[PDB]
Amino acid sequence: KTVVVTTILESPYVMMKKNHEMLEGNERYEGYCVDLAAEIAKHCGFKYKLTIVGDGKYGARDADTKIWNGMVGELVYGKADIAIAPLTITLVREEVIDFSKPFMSLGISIMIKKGTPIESAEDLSKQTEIAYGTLDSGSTKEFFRRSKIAVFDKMWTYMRSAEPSVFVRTTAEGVARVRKSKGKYAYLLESTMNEYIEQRKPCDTMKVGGNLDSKGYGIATPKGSSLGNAVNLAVLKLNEQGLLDKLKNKWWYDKGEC
Amino acid sequence: KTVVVTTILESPYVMMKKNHEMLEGNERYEGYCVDLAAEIAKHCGFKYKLTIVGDGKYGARDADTKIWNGMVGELVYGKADIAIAPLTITLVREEVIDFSKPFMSLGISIMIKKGTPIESAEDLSKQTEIAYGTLDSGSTKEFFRRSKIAVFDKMWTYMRSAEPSVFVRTTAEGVARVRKSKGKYAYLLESTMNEYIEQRKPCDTMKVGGNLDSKGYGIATPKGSSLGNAVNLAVLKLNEQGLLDKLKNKWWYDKGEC
Ligand SMILES: [Zn+2]
Numbered sequence: 001k002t003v004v005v006t007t008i009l010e011s012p013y014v015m016m017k018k019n020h021e022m023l024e025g026n027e028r029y030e031g032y033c034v035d036l037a038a039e040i041a042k043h044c045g046f047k048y049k050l051t052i053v054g055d056g057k058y059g060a061r062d063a064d065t066k067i068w069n070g071m072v073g074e075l076v077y078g079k080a081d082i083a084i085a086p087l088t089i090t091l092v093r094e095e096v097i098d099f100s101k102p103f104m105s106l107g108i109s110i111m112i113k114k115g116t117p118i119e120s121a122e123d124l125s126k127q128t129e130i131a132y133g134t135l136d137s138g139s140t141k142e143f144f145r146r147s148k149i150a151v152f153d154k155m156w157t158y159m160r161s162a163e164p165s166v167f168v169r170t171t172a173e174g175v176a177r178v179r180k181s182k183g184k185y186a187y188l189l190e191s192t193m194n195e196y197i198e199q200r201k202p203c204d205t206m207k208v209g210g211n212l213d214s215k216g217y218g219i220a221t222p223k224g225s226s227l228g229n230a231v232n233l234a235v236l237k238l239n240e241q242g243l244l245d246k247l248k249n250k251w252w253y254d255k256g257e258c
Numbered sequence: 259k260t261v262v263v264t265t266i267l268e269s270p271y272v273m274m275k276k277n278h279e280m281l282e283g284n285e286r287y288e289g290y291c292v293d294l295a296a297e298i299a300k301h302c303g304f305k306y307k308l309t310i311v312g313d314g315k316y317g318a319r320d321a322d323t324k325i326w327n328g329m330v331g332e333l334v335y336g337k338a339d340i341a342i343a344p345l346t347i348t349l350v351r352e353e354v355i356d357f358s359k360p361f362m363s364l365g366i367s368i369m370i371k372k373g374t375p376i377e378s379a380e381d382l383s384k385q386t387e388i389a390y391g392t393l394d395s396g397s398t399k400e401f402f403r404r405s406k407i408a409v410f411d412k413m414w415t416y417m418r419s420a421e422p423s424v425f426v427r428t429t430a431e432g433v434a435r436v437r438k439s440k441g442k443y444a445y446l447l448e449s450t451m452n453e454y455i456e457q458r459k460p461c462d463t464m465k466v467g468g469n470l471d472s473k474g475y476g477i478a479t480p481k482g483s484s485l486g487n488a489v490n491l492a493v494l495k496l497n498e499q500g501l502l503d504k505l506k507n508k509w510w511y512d513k514g515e516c
């Protein structure tokens with residue numbers, strides 16, 4: 001039967017085509033993950049339907065109810081068969097769902113509006129004129145919340161209490177905030193996205209400093225899924241075939257407008 | 259009871275302590291993987307014995323023999339319970355053994371003697387005065403042998419037929435060859451090793467160009483091993499806590515000699 005793929009609208013991973021209104025099904029979308037999903041479905045020989053996660057989140061566990069939201073939740077509760085998106089491989093998630101070996105390597109990075117007096121995380125933690133935050137319900141927020149290293153811990157103390165809130169619902173919201181904040185806001189996001197945005201108009205942002213950590217994105221399946229094994233080998237095969245690198249250049253720099 | 263850990267003598271992952279002759283068991287060794295093995299064992303709750311792979315190889319399957327050698331072979335045939343070393347996660351290997359999520363991210367790179375007129379793989383492929391090769395029985399050689407992209411295919415065509423052999427039995431042998439060839443030999447090895455050597459006296463080598471691919475190292479266990487699950491969670495836990503980054507700084511740069 002048709003495999004239900006959950007994903008999220010996040011450029012350049014998954015975006016609606018210009019003429020999506022006249023298109024149907026999987027044809028309505030384009031992007032790195034759209035291409036990746038097609039490659040995987042072909043090598044594993046299955047039909048699939050791309051669906052956009054209902055709450056538009058990656059996935060976090062509610063501390064009160066212990067209920068998972070986002071794409072992780074759709075997998076945990078049987079609403080989806082596989083997640084193909086820029087979903088970060090983490091311990092808390094690995095405990096409830098399965099991840100293939102990473103199809104992309106990245107790390108948390110700093111996005112500033114061009115000209116802002118910031119070059120590192122240490123620089124952000126020593127000032128208060130410039131606010132900074134992260135995406136909600138994801139791995140980046142968890143990183144700071146659970147960090148015991150001096151600089152990041154102090155950053156979390158500031159962010160978790162900040163008012164107004166420095167957290168955002170979507171990457172787009174964080175990027176917009178940096179751009180319209182005259183440089184009084186810095187956004188903490190994964191290098192993959194930072195590098196992508198840095199190459200798009202109005203070309204007013206830039207990634208500064210080195211990554212804060214090293215991790216990766218994996219294709220996720222529910223625990224005990226029959227697709228788990230196959231997808232994992234498919235990812236490795238595609239990386240060694242050079243496909244993943246091919247797709248990276250196609251959506252990041254071949255389309256770059258800066 | 260005691261878990262047999264197979265590893266390889268590869269600096270700075272595993273090395274004999276200066277006074278190993280007067281030490282016993284695991285205390286005889288030191289290095290990144292020795293430090294990592296101790297942590298993995300503590301977190302998974304098991305006692306272990308470090309052993310150096312008999313043939314000093316990482317692992318490849320003999321074409322006609324069909325027998326796996328190196329650390330992979332030790333796991334495949336039941337001589338070791340786990341491998342903790344800079345062992346690359348690859349498709350052919352994941353087909354016979356299990357790998358944890360990566361504990362280190364790296365890629366194939368080029369090592370030259372300082373002053374060598376080479377800036378990239380494309381440069382090596384378009385000339386013939388400078389010879390170049392890779393390590394034997396490993397993922398790097400397999401990368402070129404299977405590559406379908408023009409530049410690497412061209413490089414493989416040359417390397418596979420070059421005489422005398424451009425391949426080496428150990429990383430140390432390749433590094434020595436670069437150092438003694440007066441710029442007439444370039445070595446293809448993983449970025450991790452390239453970066454390490456670049457910081458070792460006589461500081462006469464350097465890493466040039468970007469990485470050729472993107473992959474990682476994983477802790478390997480025999481397929482279906484009962485240690486697999488715990489080890490994987492341990493790796494994720496340790497990466498998130500910053501131990502892996504702390505360990506790389508300790509063995510790579512804190513001890514740099516250049
Ligand atoms: Zn394909």
Ligand SMILES: [Zn+2]
Pocket residue numbers: 062063064065
């Ligand atoms: Zn709640």
Ligand SMILES: [Zn+2]
Pocket residue numbers: 297300301
């Ligand atoms: Zn520990």
